[PDB]
Amino acid sequence: MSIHSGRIAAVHNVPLSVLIRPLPSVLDPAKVQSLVDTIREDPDSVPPIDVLWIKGAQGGDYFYSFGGSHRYAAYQQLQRETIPAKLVQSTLSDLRVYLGASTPDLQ
């Protein structure tokens, strides 16, 4: 009778450089290193990080990253070009939950 409907999410290898990280990270250096070790020997055991995928007023794609901080840090320390990310389609109102009056008028 019924179906489940929701926002589109898709896992991709996303260049680290395109992830916008507005806020500072709180990091346990031990956990970053444990993650670096895991990524090196068993990357499949490290899930994709969740990323807001926002399309702006004129169709620009923007990728906002808030969580996944330890994984993000670990991929940076490995000088990786990309990171596995679950791109979750999100609206500017979704973004405003994080950014409030600082939310950009994305184009």
Contact residues: ligand ATP, CB under 6 A: 31, 34-35, 38, 45-47, 67-71
Q: How many CB atoms lie within 10 A of CB 102?
A: 9
Q: How far is the CB of 78 from Mg ion (least distance, A)?
A: 18
Q: How far is the CB of 106 from ligand ATP (least distance, A)?
A: 23
The H-or-E segment that residue 20 falls in is strand 19-20
Please report, as residue ranges, which positions from 24 to 83 form the binding site for Mg ion (by CB under 5 A).
Answer: 67
Angle between helices 69-77 and 29-41 (to 10 degrees): 60
- The 3-state DSSP class for residue 97 equals helix
The nearer residue to ligand ATP, 53 or 72, going by C-beta atoms, is 72
38 binds, among ligand ATP, Mg ion, none (CB under 5 to 8 A by kind): ligand ATP
Question: How many CA atoms within 13 Å lie on the side-chain side of 39?
Answer: 22
Q: How far is the CB of 17 from ligand ATP (least distance, A)?
A: 19
Residues near Mg ion (CB under 5 A) are 67
